[PDB]
RNA sequence: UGGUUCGUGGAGCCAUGGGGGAAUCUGGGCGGACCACCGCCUAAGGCUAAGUACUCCGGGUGACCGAUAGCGCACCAGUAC
RNA sequence: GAGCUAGCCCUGGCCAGGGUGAAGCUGGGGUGAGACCCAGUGGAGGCCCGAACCGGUGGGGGAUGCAAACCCCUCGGAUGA
RNA sequence: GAAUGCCGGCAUGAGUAACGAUAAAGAGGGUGAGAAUCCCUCUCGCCGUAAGCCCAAGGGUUCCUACGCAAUGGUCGUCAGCGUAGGGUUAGGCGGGACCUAAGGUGAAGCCGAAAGGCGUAGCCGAAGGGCAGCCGGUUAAUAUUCCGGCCCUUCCCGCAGGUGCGAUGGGGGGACGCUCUAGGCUAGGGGGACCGGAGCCAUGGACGAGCCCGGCCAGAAGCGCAGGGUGGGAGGUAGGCAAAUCCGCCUCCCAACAAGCUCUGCGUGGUGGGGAAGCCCGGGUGACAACCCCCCGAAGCCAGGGAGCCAAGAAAAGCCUCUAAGCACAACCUGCGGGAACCCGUACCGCAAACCGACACAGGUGGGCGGGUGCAAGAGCACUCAGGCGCGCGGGAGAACCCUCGCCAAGGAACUCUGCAAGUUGGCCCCGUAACUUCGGGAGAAGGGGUGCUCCCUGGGGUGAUGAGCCCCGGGGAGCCGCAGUGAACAGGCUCUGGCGACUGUUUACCAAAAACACAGCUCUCUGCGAACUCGUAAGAGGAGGUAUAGGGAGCGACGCUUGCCCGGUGCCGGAAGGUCAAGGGGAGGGGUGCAAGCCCCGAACCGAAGCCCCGGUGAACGGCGGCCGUAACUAUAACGGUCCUAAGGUAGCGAAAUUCCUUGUCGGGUAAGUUCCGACCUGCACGAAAAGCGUAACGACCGGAGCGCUGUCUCGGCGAGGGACCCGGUGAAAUUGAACUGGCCGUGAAGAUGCGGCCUACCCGUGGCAGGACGAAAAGACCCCGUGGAGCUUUACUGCAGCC
RNA sequence: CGAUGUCGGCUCGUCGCAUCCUGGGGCUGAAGAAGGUCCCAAGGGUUGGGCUGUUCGCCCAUUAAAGCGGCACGCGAGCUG
RNA sequence: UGGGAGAGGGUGGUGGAAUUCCCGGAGUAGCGGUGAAAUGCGCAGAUACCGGGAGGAACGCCGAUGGCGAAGGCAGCCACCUGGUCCACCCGUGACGCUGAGGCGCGAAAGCGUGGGGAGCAAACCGGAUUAGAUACCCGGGUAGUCCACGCCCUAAACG
RNA sequence: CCGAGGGUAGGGCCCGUGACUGGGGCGAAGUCGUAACAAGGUAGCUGUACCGGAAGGUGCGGCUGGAU
């Protein structure tokens, strides 16, 4: 559920927050956290290379295990599910029987007290990790590697998932969260289930301040600027765009495709995204 | 109101200091010039 | 592409970023597209005094200044500020 | 040249007193169970009043100033972007 | 001789403005050549969440003393932050370094770049963060947690004793963390005391009193007590913590568990050491053998790493504990004791300011801590006041205009004016009471009203005690007293109605705009499959993001409600293996130059040959666009209807004289005696209209309109009064400006607005306070306008190129 | 154009007379009262308010009357803005 | 107590037919559509045919003048949870009953909020026809919606 | 003290009236079309929804109070 508020200030009227119902442990695992170097959107030259970032709550980085093929056959107990400020998904605390502890992103349905495992022989159940070639076609899966041994890259955002659609030689064919149809290699790991916290998308920030907490600084329309600044700048009074609507840097921004044409992975993308 | 000189000794040495000047081709050329000119002080005097 | 007086010109020569790519004197480059003839010269390794430039420095000399001039400074000045 | 100013980064510090009284929780009532209602408790919030602090609305004064942007009166924010 | 020339000197304005907060002064004494200004005393006033005190920056001798007064000081000066000299800053425990890491910086490895140079995991640097051992008093002219005294403590070296598998830069624990709220017990700090100690006092009508006035503490090892923090113990397994590990992690079992124990801290006590007032005598003496006790209040501080709740989910590293590795186990490490050892830098003084930033001893600016008492509901607010510190480095008179700041005002009460601009009114707390509308929160402090002092009597509950007394807190009821008046002073909302805009708190043009502008939650379009797109960079490398389509970029719109129509011909974007065009290159029919020749060299048609463009289609919350004429209805008028030209299609819903309406003060209605504004309507909309969104919308607004009540010196319409200036006298003493001047009025004249020319008129010489008509007054080589084949910012389907992309 | 500050208002006037009123008069289609029209006359007077930035104008209520012009569209080293 | 029938309700699964689109193959000049046509689609290779895939929706035959429910209404198959109801036995209770103003719940479709989903169909809308005209009927397109979850709405020729 | 009433302020219900505006009834001598009644020339009606000069149309679902 998302949580509502009575309109006892003008902002609480529309603000909603997550319910955090799945959360069972309110403090990170000290050996699995490290400091996050906050950037402001500035690169190593000092220059802002991404606008309007800065000023959010402080965060510790929780180290996530996006490999998992790292510990084949060694099962683990799900110790706790926790809040993770670095992602929309919650994260799950794993206690391997080995004694090693790691985090994974928490799939929808994962229960604390339950066991998970990774490897070619893992049961096809929620929370387990296997190479794609061993997962029954039709099953929905998350945290997918894009190339073998290179780490989970696909379906990690709250509520996302890919579904295995079929196989072809060394590859299986997934339907990505975008609806893109892609061949991923059969040897790539993936975890059965969808990512949790699926109500994430229904949160209503509610006030300027809450974006401010997220490290999102105010964003300013090209229209509200001047010609030195932006193609849409200037003009006396309000103005329509007066040219094809553009980015600050002049490239067109309603429709112009931008994916590089001759890119090697084109050979592996079967169908571009939907809608 | 708050004016523009707000002395700070560390800021002065880190910024205009002898070592700062040497670290850079441009800064070393300031020293070349101030030496060629006979400057008594090549670098802001600062108390330390 | 640069260099040359040569700004694409009939544009050779010298140099070379890209591609191709030899020969050892019956070899090669050159004499302003190119060809012939007639000549000149020996590429793709290196060094080499002197005659030449300059004036922080020392000295000599002015139909040069003479303290608002002459160096910014005749003086504790690249100082005070 | 960011010792002013603008943004961001790291690490610290500050915000009198007063008011309103969200969720929850407890008890009562209600019902098949419920929703829900009432009371108490609770103490939320770019909530309220108002110092510090941050501002600079209106007016007057200043105008070779006290000041190359000040003064008095008034006024905005004051747990938060 | 002129360049608003340059440099310098000296005039003018002028004995003029001014002498820098309106907190405020007076007198007596001293000193000295000289005194409003220096010292001393008494009186007066100001600050007192400071205008007192302590730290950090910055400053750099300004500190203290002696001797000085040319200059510096807005006056004076005997004085001084000034001149000369002399002195003065003392640390194992404070701060920083011989400790740690943060951003960031630098940088073995490594990467990149014409050179210079740019990056870069480790490492190193980097602190106001972490770590770390000192408290109280005394002393100097001037330093003191530094010297001294007293009581405590840290590390290193060595040794002795006891103990133990010792050993690390490697493994682990820990260090270690948010915001709001908050419990218990303390402490700081404070109030009272009939109790304790004290020099003394009885005035002026009364008081020898349970009188007045003054004080009634500080630090302290172990032990002890109180309150807290931290923390389970044993055993077995073990494949993880890039070696090892008995540690840590994981599994199992046993005992313990809102206990304890152990351990660390706070506080109390505690051997001891210190301090110790008023007043009175000259900083010191005394008071004094000072007393040093009880009760109440009580933190934002401490115990602390406490507790709850919440979402935005809250540094690192060392110290420290533990584990083992090379080793070494006569070693080494731990514990206790003893002796020795313990370096460098800072330390003066200013520090909300006359010593810092503002050219000035400048009404400005400057981070942290302390910041007493009483009353006012509270408070860091306000008034007064303690300690402490000040009267602001020109004064003395006078009592005009005028100006500033301030107080009052008959009758009227907005008639003022662009505007109630400004000033009134209102004003705190308690109680009663409170509308439309609403998103059900609100609107609300709506509005409006009543109460408010003191005295006596009765009485309810809480805290501290003990259950009681005393003390402190929150009330209730009764009877009365006084004044014009009881938040009696000071601090402290005027209100209502109705429209526009913007939902809202926020942001902005530092220094003429705070807004309706920007932002904002929220809505849509679009790009992006991850070595993402995108941005910065030549590159390497970064950001994006240690993120992964519930994510990231770009764009527009702007809470929310009801909505968002038609046109894809043009431009854009998307899609389109056809077709047309299409460069280098390929190809080489054919042709040429030259040579005796082989040959060498040149031109070159067909034809093959990308993107782009053409072309075909899509696409509007992509750029954009969204008609005209003729006729027609029982009288006129109008035209539901018909016809016709044009177009890519001809404006839908809603709204409409509008932040848009030219004509225009449209017309009609409302409000007023009177309404170019305002509100409601109408609709021939010059020239609204649906995300450059349309129409609404509760709540909000130092936004912009219109009206009403309240109340006023805004006004009829002005008067009086106050203080600071203006004025006079002493002191000090500017400025712009200035061709020179012996510088009147009229009517004319003149380059067309005359002190300066003509004619007339008028007029003795020279000032002071005032007024502003003129000197086309001053300032600023007009900012508008034009001109210059002058500049610069910006735009695009101007030209031409470049990055970038294909 | 090396600057002659610009609308309206306020304040302060002063002048012209082609006179709004008041005084004198001729003609009248002047019985009277009241008017019209012209002439002489500038001594004095010439109101308060609603609208609008307005000047102007319209309007309310009065009046003997509610004059029109000049003075750099009088007057910003006099104020406003 | 023992038995029965049934698209009664809820959840979870799950099968094949068809349509659509995508991929491969093969193939050529039309297909489609109507009263007849046109728009549309098709030599940029459509239609028709084969194989592969994706996806949503509805469940042909059985099927009925059938069944179940209070009504709205309910239909592939499977399991689980669950209501109503009928029969037989004549075992138990001993009038414990009927109706029911208010109240409470359920209530087709369309519609609405948030989020999914979207093959076919299809208001609005575009275009072709028909026609005197044709904002219709018919033809080619087409968005809400139709579908799912959760919350609303509370109507009906909700009829026997 | 209470007290007729007076005054101030804010509420509630009712009636009259109002620029303008929405439909309604009627009149009828008109314009436009022909929606229903026949299979009414697209069976009708229906709740809802979107739409159109107008009766109306179409979608979805329902009823027969449908002709053949
Ligand atoms: Mg809410
Ligand atoms: Mg709620
Ligand atoms: Mg509210
Ligand atoms: Mg709100
Ligand atoms: Mg959760
Ligand atoms: Mg959940
Ligand atoms: Mg935490
Ligand atoms: Mg760590
Ligand atoms: Mg990180
Ligand atoms: Mg860096
Ligand atoms: Mg950006
Ligand atoms: Mg940024
Ligand atoms: Mg999370
Ligand atoms: Mg969330
Ligand atoms: Mg969203
Ligand atoms: Mg955050
Ligand atoms: Mg954003
Ligand atoms: Mg914006
Ligand atoms: Mg703008
Ligand atoms: Mg702008
Ligand atoms: Mg710029
Ligand atoms: Mg530009
Ligand atoms: Mg531009
Ligand atoms: Mg523009
Ligand atoms: Mg424009
Ligand atoms: Mg603009
Ligand atoms: Mg304009
Ligand atoms: Mg415009
Ligand atoms: Mg603009
Ligand atoms: Mg424009
Ligand atoms: Mg536009
Ligand atoms: Mg345009
Ligand atoms: Mg790939
Ligand atoms: Mg500063
Ligand atoms: Mg410093
Ligand atoms: Mg510093
Ligand atoms: Mg600094
Ligand atoms: Mg330096
Ligand atoms: Mg020297
Ligand atoms: Mg230098
Ligand atoms: Mg030529
Ligand atoms: Mg050449
Ligand atoms: Mg070469
Ligand atoms: Mg030869
Ligand atoms: Mg040869
Ligand atoms: Mg050669
Ligand atoms: Mg030659
Ligand atoms: Mg030669
Ligand atoms: Mg020689
Ligand atoms: Mg030589
Ligand atoms: Mg000289
Ligand atoms: Mg010299
Ligand atoms: Mg000189
Ligand atoms: Mg000198
Ligand atoms: Mg110098
Ligand atoms: Mg911090
Ligand atoms: Mg605050
Ligand atoms: Mg709530
Ligand atoms: Mg609770
Ligand atoms: Mg607030
Ligand atoms: Mg507030
Ligand atoms: Mg104050
Ligand atoms: Mg101001
Ligand atoms: Mg005011
Ligand atoms: Mg002024
Ligand atoms: Mg000024
Ligand atoms: Mg003030
Ligand atoms: Mg105020
Ligand atoms: Mg605020
Ligand atoms: Mg406030
Ligand atoms: Mg706020
Ligand atoms: Mg001359
Ligand atoms: Mg001059
Ligand atoms: Mg000069
Ligand atoms: Mg000069
Ligand atoms: Mg004078
Ligand atoms: Mg003067
Ligand atoms: Mg002065
Ligand atoms: Mg003074
Ligand atoms: Mg004053
Ligand atoms: Mg004196
Ligand atoms: Mg003297
Ligand atoms: Mg003195
Ligand atoms: Mg100094
Ligand atoms: Mg000193
Ligand atoms: Mg002197
Ligand atoms: Mg002197
Ligand atoms: Mg003297
Ligand atoms: Mg002086
Ligand atoms: Mg001075
Ligand atoms: Mg003397
Ligand atoms: Mg001094
Ligand atoms: Mg010591
Ligand atoms: Mg050492
Ligand atoms: Mg270090
Ligand atoms: Mg430190
Ligand atoms: Mg101590
Ligand atoms: Mg000393
Ligand atoms: Mg031991
Ligand atoms: Mg260790
Ligand atoms: Mg941590
Ligand atoms: Mg910390
Ligand atoms: Mg103490
Ligand atoms: Mg007290
Ligand atoms: Mg083990
Ligand atoms: Mg004593
Ligand atoms: Mg004694
Ligand atoms: Mg680190
Ligand atoms: Mg040393
Ligand atoms: Mg010291
Ligand atoms: Mg101050
Ligand atoms: Mg300066
Ligand atoms: Mg002074
Ligand atoms: Mg008070
Ligand atoms: Mg108070
Ligand atoms: Mg004074
Ligand atoms: Mg006088
Ligand atoms: Mg009066
Ligand atoms: Mg009034
Ligand atoms: Mg009145
Ligand atoms: Mg007004
Ligand atoms: Mg008050
Ligand atoms: Mg009302
Ligand atoms: Mg309400
Ligand atoms: Mg009130
Ligand atoms: Mg009294
Ligand atoms: Mg006061
Ligand atoms: Mg107030
Ligand atoms: Mg109102
Ligand atoms: Mg308006
Ligand atoms: Mg606003
Ligand atoms: Mg705004
Ligand atoms: Mg709104
Ligand atoms: Mg908004
Ligand atoms: Mg806002
Ligand atoms: Mg400005
Ligand atoms: Mg400004
Ligand atoms: Mg400026
Ligand atoms: Mg200003
Ligand atoms: Mg402004
Ligand atoms: Mg404002
Ligand atoms: Mg703005
Ligand atoms: Mg805005
Ligand atoms: Mg919106
Ligand atoms: Mg770039
Ligand atoms: Mg990189
Ligand atoms: Mg990163
Ligand atoms: Mg991301
Ligand atoms: Mg905006
Ligand atoms: Mg509404
Ligand atoms: Mg239309
Ligand atoms: Mg178009
Ligand atoms: Mg188009
Ligand atoms: Mg165009
Ligand atoms: Mg073909
Ligand atoms: Mg040939
Ligand atoms: Mg167009
Ligand atoms: Mg547009
Ligand atoms: Mg007619
Ligand atoms: Mg209109
Ligand atoms: Mg009007
Ligand atoms: Mg309007
Ligand atoms: Mg406007
Ligand atoms: Mg308009
Ligand atoms: Mg108009
Ligand atoms: Mg107009
Ligand atoms: Mg008019
Ligand atoms: Mg108006
Ligand atoms: Mg106006
Ligand atoms: Mg009209
Ligand atoms: Mg726009
Ligand atoms: Mg607009
Ligand atoms: Mg638009
Ligand atoms: Mg509107
Ligand atoms: Mg509104
Ligand atoms: Mg506002
Ligand atoms: Mg405002
Ligand atoms: Mg007055
Ligand atoms: Mg007075
Ligand atoms: Mg006076
Ligand atoms: Mg006076
Ligand atoms: Mg005199
Ligand atoms: Mg003369
Ligand atoms: Mg003249
Ligand atoms: Mg004259
Ligand atoms: Mg003369
Ligand atoms: Mg005369
Ligand atoms: Mg004058
Ligand atoms: Mg004047
Ligand atoms: Mg003159
Ligand atoms: Mg003048
Ligand atoms: Mg010039
Ligand atoms: Mg000029
Ligand atoms: Mg000019
Ligand atoms: Mg001109
Ligand atoms: Mg030209
Ligand atoms: Mg010319
Ligand atoms: Mg030019
Ligand atoms: Mg230019
Ligand atoms: Mg691009
Ligand atoms: Mg001019
Ligand atoms: Mg001038
Ligand atoms: Mg002038
Ligand atoms: Mg003007
Ligand atoms: Mg008569
Ligand atoms: Mg008569
Ligand atoms: Mg007269
Ligand atoms: Mg006269
Ligand atoms: Mg007017
Ligand atoms: Mg007018
Ligand atoms: Mg008369
Ligand atoms: Mg004129
Ligand atoms: Mg004028
Ligand atoms: Mg004027
Ligand atoms: Mg002026
Ligand atoms: Mg004027
Ligand atoms: Mg003037
Ligand atoms: Mg003048
Ligand atoms: Mg004046
Ligand atoms: Mg049946
Ligand atoms: Mg029986
Ligand atoms: Mg229903
Ligand atoms: Mg439905
Ligand atoms: Mg529907
Ligand atoms: Mg039926
Ligand atoms: Mg009466
Ligand atoms: Mg019909
Ligand atoms: Mg029909
Ligand atoms: Mg029509
Ligand atoms: Mg239709
Ligand atoms: Mg039915």
Coordinates of C-alpha atoms (C1' of nucleotides) in Angstrom, one line a residue, chain E residues 320-468:
Chain E
rC320 C1' 41.6 0.7 21.5
rC321 C1' 40.1 -5.0 22.1
rU322 C1' 40.8 -9.6 19.8
rC323 C1' 42.8 -13.3 16.1
rU324 C1' 46.4 -15.6 14.3
rA325 C1' 51.5 -15.2 10.0
rA326 C1' 56.6 -14.9 9.0
rG327 C1' 59.3 -15.0 13.4
rC328 C1' 60.5 -15.9 18.4
rA329 C1' 59.8 -18.6 22.4
rC330 C1' 67.1 -17.0 27.7
rA331 C1' 62.5 -13.6 23.3
rA332 C1' 58.2 -11.0 23.5
rC333 C1' 53.7 -9.2 25.2
rC334 C1' 50.2 -8.3 29.6
rU335 C1' 49.5 -6.6 34.9
rG336 C1' 51.8 -4.2 39.4
rC337 C1' 55.7 -1.5 41.4
rG338 C1' 60.2 1.5 41.1
rG339 C1' 63.7 4.8 38.8
rG340 C1' 64.9 7.8 34.8
rA341 C1' 63.0 10.5 30.2
rA342 C1' 59.3 13.8 28.1
rC343 C1' 60.9 17.8 21.9
rC344 C1' 59.1 21.9 18.4
rC345 C1' 55.4 26.1 17.4
rG346 C1' 51.5 29.4 19.9
rU347 C1' 50.5 32.1 24.3
rA348 C1' 51.4 40.0 25.0
rC349 C1' 47.2 43.1 23.5
rC350 C1' 42.3 44.4 20.4
rG351 C1' 38.5 41.0 19.2
rC352 C1' 30.4 43.3 17.4
rA353 C1' 35.4 46.6 17.4
rA354 C1' 38.9 53.6 17.8
rA355 C1' 43.4 47.7 17.2
rC356 C1' 39.2 42.9 12.3
rC357 C1' 36.6 44.0 6.6
rG358 C1' 34.6 48.9 5.0
rA359 C1' 40.8 55.0 2.0
rC360 C1' 38.6 57.7 8.1
rA361 C1' 39.1 56.7 15.7
rC362 C1' 33.4 55.5 9.4
rA363 C1' 25.5 55.1 12.8
rG364 C1' 27.5 49.5 7.9
rG365 C1' 29.6 44.1 8.0
rU366 C1' 31.9 40.0 11.4
rG367 C1' 31.4 32.8 13.6
rG368 C1' 31.1 30.2 18.9
rG369 C1' 30.1 30.2 24.5
rC370 C1' 28.3 33.0 29.3
rG371 C1' 24.5 36.5 29.5
rG372 C1' 22.0 37.9 37.0
rG373 C1' 17.1 40.1 39.5
rU374 C1' 11.7 41.7 39.4
rG375 C1' 7.2 42.4 36.9
rC376 C1' 4.4 41.7 32.6
rA377 C1' 0.7 34.3 30.8
rA378 C1' 5.6 32.5 28.6
rG379 C1' 10.4 34.1 26.6
rA380 C1' 16.7 35.3 24.7
rG381 C1' 10.2 39.8 24.1
rC382 C1' 9.3 44.6 27.1
rA383 C1' 10.3 48.3 31.2
rC384 C1' 13.6 49.1 35.2
rU385 C1' 17.9 47.3 37.2
rC386 C1' 23.0 43.9 39.3
rA387 C1' 28.0 42.8 38.0
rG388 C1' 30.4 45.2 34.7
rG389 C1' 30.7 49.2 31.1
rC390 C1' 29.6 53.7 29.2
rG391 C1' 27.7 59.7 28.3
rC392 C1' 29.3 58.2 21.8
rG393 C1' 37.0 63.5 21.0
rC394 C1' 34.2 70.5 20.0
rG395 C1' 31.8 73.6 23.2
rG396 C1' 28.8 78.1 25.1
rG397 C1' 24.4 80.8 24.2
rA398 C1' 19.9 82.0 21.9
rG399 C1' 14.4 80.4 21.7
rA400 C1' 13.1 83.7 14.0
rA401 C1' 11.7 81.7 9.4
rC402 C1' 12.3 76.8 7.5
rC403 C1' 13.5 71.4 7.9
rC404 C1' 13.8 66.9 10.6
rU405 C1' 11.8 63.5 14.7
rC406 C1' 8.0 64.0 18.1
rG407 C1' 3.1 65.4 21.5
rC408 C1' -2.0 67.7 21.4
rC409 C1' -6.2 69.8 19.0
rA410 C1' -12.8 72.8 18.6
rA411 C1' -16.6 71.1 14.8
rG412 C1' -16.3 67.9 10.7
rG413 C1' -14.4 62.9 9.5
rA414 C1' -11.4 60.9 3.4
rA415 C1' -14.5 66.3 1.8
rC416 C1' -7.2 64.8 1.0
rU417 C1' -5.1 62.4 -3.2
rC418 C1' -3.2 58.6 -8.7
rU419 C1' -4.2 55.8 -3.9
rG420 C1' -6.6 56.8 3.2
rC421 C1' 0.0 57.6 0.7
rA422 C1' 1.0 58.7 5.6
rA423 C1' -0.9 58.7 10.6
rG424 C1' -5.0 57.2 13.5
rU425 C1' -7.9 53.0 15.1
rU426 C1' -7.1 47.8 16.6
rG427 C1' -3.6 45.5 20.0
rG428 C1' -1.7 40.9 25.4
rC429 C1' -4.2 37.2 28.2
rC430 C1' -9.1 34.8 30.0
rC431 C1' -14.3 33.8 28.8
rC432 C1' -18.6 34.1 25.5
rG433 C1' -19.4 33.9 20.6
rU434 C1' -18.6 33.3 15.5
rA435 C1' -21.3 33.5 8.3
rA436 C1' -20.9 32.5 3.0
rC437 C1' -17.9 28.9 0.9
rU438 C1' -15.0 24.4 1.5
rU439 C1' -10.6 20.1 -1.0
rC440 C1' -14.1 19.0 5.5
rG441 C1' -8.1 20.5 7.2
rG442 C1' -10.2 24.9 7.0
rG443 C1' -12.1 29.8 6.2
rA444 C1' -11.0 31.5 12.4
rG445 C1' -7.8 35.7 16.1
rA446 C1' -13.7 35.5 11.0
rA447 C1' -17.1 39.0 12.8
rG448 C1' -18.7 40.9 17.6
rG449 C1' -18.6 41.2 22.7
rG450 C1' -17.7 40.7 28.2
rG451 C1' -13.5 40.3 31.9
rU452 C1' -8.7 42.3 33.5
rG453 C1' -6.4 46.5 39.9
rC454 C1' -6.3 46.0 45.1
rU455 C1' -8.4 44.2 50.0
rC456 C1' -10.6 40.5 53.4
rC457 C1' -13.1 35.6 54.2
rC458 C1' -14.1 30.6 52.6
rU459 C1' -12.3 26.8 49.5
rG460 C1' -10.2 22.6 45.3
rG461 C1' -6.0 19.9 43.1
rG462 C1' -0.5 19.2 42.0
rG463 C1' 5.1 19.2 43.1
rU464 C1' 8.7 18.9 47.2
rG465 C1' 8.5 16.9 51.9
rA466 C1' 6.9 12.1 55.1
rU467 C1' 1.1 11.1 54.7
rG468 C1' 2.6 16.7 57.8

